[PDB]
């Protein structure tokens with residue numbers, strides 16, 4: 608599946624923590640085999 | 644609102660990245676004033 612996303616830092620702007628959030632969501636669906 | 648969650652590490656077990664995911668979700672709803 609997708610490789611594990613890189614955490615952008617505590618001080619990353621909110622738009623970068625929303626991109627990271629969406630990529631962790633993808634990753635977690637794939638690891639748990641639950642692509643809903 | 645809630646204080647910014649601590650990232651558990653790249654090597655944290657999947658259940659700990661699902662807890663972090665849920666707490667970042669909370670945090671991001673509050674920062675964006677969109678508590679749906």
Ligand SMILES: [Zn+2]
Pocket residue numbers: 608609610
């Ligand atoms: Zn792969």
Ligand SMILES: [Zn+2]
Pocket residue numbers: 644645646
């Ligand atoms: Zn507060």
